[PDB]
Every structure is written in C-alpha cells, then in structure tokens.
Scaffold this active site. Structure first.
Site, mmCIF file in Angstrom:
data_model
loop_
_atom_site.group_PDB
_atom_site.id
_atom_site.type_symbol
_atom_site.label_atom_id
_atom_site.label_comp_id
_atom_site.label_asym_id
_atom_site.label_seq_id
_atom_site.Cartn_x
_atom_site.Cartn_y
_atom_site.Cartn_z
ATOM 1 C CB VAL A 26 -0.985 -0.065 1.180
ATOM 2 C CG1 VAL A 26 -1.520 1.301 1.578
ATOM 3 C CG2 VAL A 26 -2.126 -1.019 0.855
ATOM 4 N N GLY A 27 2.108 1.181 0.528
ATOM 5 C CA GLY A 27 2.918 2.392 0.765
ATOM 6 C C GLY A 27 4.243 2.111 1.447
ATOM 7 C CB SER A 28 7.436 2.314 1.470
ATOM 8 O OG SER A 28 7.301 2.485 0.070
ATOM 9 N N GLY A 29 6.892 4.960 3.731
ATOM 10 C CA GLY A 29 7.702 6.091 4.226
ATOM 11 C C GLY A 29 9.172 5.706 4.312
ATOM 12 C CB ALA A 30 12.239 7.447 5.192
ATOM 13 N N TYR A 31 10.433 5.359 7.394
ATOM 14 C CA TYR A 31 10.346 4.668 8.713
ATOM 15 C C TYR A 31 9.898 3.201 8.545
ATOM 16 N N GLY A 32 9.337 2.846 7.382
ATOM 17 C CA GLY A 32 8.909 1.462 7.075
ATOM 18 C C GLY A 32 8.106 1.317 5.787
ATOM 19 C CB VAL A 34 2.199 0.094 5.080
ATOM 20 C CG1 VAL A 34 0.808 -0.330 5.546
ATOM 21 C CG2 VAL A 34 2.840 1.017 6.115
ATOM 22 C CG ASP A 164 0.275 8.548 10.466
ATOM 23 O OD1 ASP A 164 0.294 7.335 10.805
ATOM 24 O OD2 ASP A 164 0.371 8.943 9.276
#
Ligand SMILES: Cc1noc2c1[C@@H](O)[C@@]13CNC[C@@H]1C[C@@H]2N3C
Ligand SMILES: [Cl-]
Ligand SMILES: [Cl-]
Ligand SMILES: [Cl-]
Ligand SMILES: [Cl-]
Ligand SMILES: [Cl-]
Ligand SMILES: [Mg+2]
Length: 348
Positions: A26-32, A34, A164
């Site tokens: 579904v997604g990816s920040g720089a913290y993980g 998903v 969040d």
C-alpha cells in the site's frame, strides 16, 4: 509461538504469522513499508507495517521504543490502537525486525473535505470526535504535534480515529514552502518561539474546523513568513504580554518590525456559519497558547449540545515517559523494545 511464512513484496522479505493472508503493498515512508492484509483470527482488514532499520542508530532505536510504547498505551474509540506486534526472532540474540498491526483505514478527512458537501451537523460530529480523542491523549500528558486532515481516518458510519502521532522531528525540507505539513502548525512551534505544550494541538483543531466550514485551507502560506503574515492578519499582532513569553530574542525583534494589526471580525470571515461555530473558533485560534480553550473545556461548549455526554468522555491510564530523558546504548534500547514485543496482550 505461531508458524511464520516468507514472501518477497517489492524487493522486501516479509515473514509473518499464518493468520495474516493476501498481503498487498500500500505504501512506504522512510520509517517502514506497509501491506494491507486479511486477519483470519479476527475477520478485520489490517495494515501490517514492517519497520526499516529499526536499530541502526541510538536515535532510531529510541524512536522504535517510543512508537511501540505509545501504540501499546492508546485504548480509546477515537484513537488508533495496536491490534498486534510480532517478530520472527526466537531470542534477543537473533532479534532484528519489528512488525506493527492496526485496523486498515479507508478514507481520511482530506478525501471527504475535497470531494463531499458537509452540513453543520457533520462538522459538529467530526470536531466532537477529534476533541473526545484529544481529551484522552492530553490526560496522559501526550502531545500529538501533527494533527492535519491526512492524519484523521473516518468510516462509513462517520466514526473518526486520530492516527500518525508525531514521534520524530520533521526534516527542515519537509516543512519548506507551499506544503500541508506546515499549514496546521501553531506559530510558537513553526518559529520556535518558546517551550511548547499540549495547547499546540488545539490550534490545529481550529485550522481543521475552519477548513470543514469553508472547504478551503485557513493559512495556506507559501513559506514560514508568508504563513505568519496570514495568521497575524486574522488574529492580530502580539501585545506586550505575549512578547515577554517569546524566549527567543531574535524572534521578538522580528515580530516588532511588523506594523500593528487588530483581530478581525470572525463573523465577517466565516460568512453564514453557525454563530456557535464562530464563537468556538475565536476560543481555539488565540495567538497566546496560555489563553486557548482546552479539549475538556471545548467538549462542554454549546456547539456540541447534541453529542456531549460527560459520563462517556473517558481519560487515559497514567503514562510513564521517564525514558525520554534516559541516555542508553543501542543494545539497551533494543532489549527494552524486545521485552515490550513479548509482553503484548491483544485487545478483547
Ligand atoms: C467515507 C465517506 N465518504 O463520503 C462520506 C463519508 C462519511 O464519512 C460521511 C459521514 N459524515 C461525513 C462524511 C460525508 C459522507 N458521509 C455522510
Ligand atoms: Cl498464525
Ligand atoms: Cl483502533
Ligand atoms: Cl527478527
Ligand atoms: Cl493533510
Ligand atoms: Cl506507563
Ligand atoms: Mg500521516
């Protein structure tokens, strides 16, 4: 211990218990990273988040511990909670990976403000739920610090959840220019005027409520200084009393360079809004943070008469944040995190 299975999803090895089926990125920040999944034990559609490099530095190890402690504590109808936390490791010696499981969120407030027509009744119910959740968060002496429409998820029943939490400092780059990441921030935090406290979250609720009423961002600044000029035109320039509370000497000097302006008439800005909505905005959008309305005080405002029930607005268990001033090594933060993973008890 459950049985785990492995798969590669967009260049990443995922190792998860068999209960979690149909994983899809579904997604990816720089913290993980998903994935959405189906939880066969509960029948919920869930978000599974695999942390990236959770123990790579002291700062990262402590952030990992902070996020798990906060999610384990939050048990309220209007706040994201933790459904599960797991690691495929069988001991501390082989512990490297952390996975967090929450309810899968459909729409956020951004989707509904942009693409739907909201009545005053809808605005009362949505803002009521944000404040019910904030009364709970603030009773534990937790500050959210990042409330904005993209951090407020809602279901078909109009039921709202805060998510969040602000758990790391934002990057200077992320706060620069014409960006939604800054439009909801209180001026004392945007410009580092003074030590801030939980009052910063009530400024953000004022900005979100204004946008639900008008369909337009309240303070869409092109940079920090443009946004401050938008704010002072609405609420007026600071008097001697607030200038004394700005600990930063250079920040004080800049403010005094600006021509004095009075507070505007909010009935002439929010044309046609419920007079009770106008009154509550004037009590949230106060430049001096000491004088803003609190979440508990706002719940008792006449705007929420239809929804307010002082026997169904609960407070939090006490929350011990003494770890925040503790100096530890990477392996000590990693051991504290391992203990919190193995002691987790799922909700009823
Ligand atoms: C999702 C979703 N998409 O559109 C809507 C929703 C619901 O949250 C909502 C409940 N109250 C405000 C929202 C507007 C409209 N529906 C009446
Ligand atoms: Cl399982
Ligand atoms: Cl939840
Ligand atoms: Cl591991
Ligand atoms: Cl947003
Ligand atoms: Cl605690
Ligand atoms: Mg977010």
């Amino acid at each position: 211990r459950p049985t785990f299975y492995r798969q590669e999803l967009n260049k990443t090895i995922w190792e998860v218990p068999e209960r979690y089926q149909n994983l899809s990125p579904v997604g990816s920040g720089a913290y993980g990273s998903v994935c959405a999944a189906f939880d066969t034990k509960t029948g919920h559609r869930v978000a599974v988040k695999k942390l990236s490099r959770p123990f790579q530095s002291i700062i990262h190890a402590k952030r990992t511990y902070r996020e798990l402690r906060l999610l384990k504590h939050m048990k309220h109808e209007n706040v994201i909670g933790l459904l599960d936390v797991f690691t495929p490791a069988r001991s501390l010696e082989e512990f490297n990976d952390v996975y967090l499981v929450t309810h899968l969120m459909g729409a956020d407030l951004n989707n509904i403000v942009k693409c739907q027509k909201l009545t005053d009744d809808h605005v009362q119910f949505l803002i009521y739920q944000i404040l019910r959740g904030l009364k709970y968060i603030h009773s534990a002496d937790i500050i959210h610090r990042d409330l904005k429409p993209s951090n407020l998820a809602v279901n078909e029943d109009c039921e709202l959840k805060i998510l969040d939490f602000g758990l790391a400092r934002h990057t200077d780059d992320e706060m620069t220019g014409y960006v939604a990441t800054r439009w909801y921030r209180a001026p004392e935090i945007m410009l580092n005027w003074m030590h801030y406290n939980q009052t910063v979250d009530i400024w953000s609720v004022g900005c979100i409520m204004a946008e639900l009423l008008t369909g337009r961002t309240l303070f869409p600044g092109t940079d920090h200084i443009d946004q401050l000029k938008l704010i002072l035109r609405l609420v007026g320039t600071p008097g001697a009393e607030l200038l004394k509370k700005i600990s930063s000497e250079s920040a004080r000097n800049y403010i005094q360079s600006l021509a004095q302006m009075p507070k505007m008439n909010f009935a002439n800005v929010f044309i046609g809004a419920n007079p009770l909505a106008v009154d509550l905005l004037e009590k949230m959008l106060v430049l001096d943070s000491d004088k803003r309305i609190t979440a508990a005080q706002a719940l008792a405002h006449a705007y929420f008469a239809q929804y307010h029930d002082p026997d169904d607005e609960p407070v939090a268990d006490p929350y011990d944040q003494s770890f925040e001033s503790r100096d530890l090594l990477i392996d000590e933060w990693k051991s504290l995190t391992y203990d919190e993973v193995i002691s987790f008890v799922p909700p009823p």
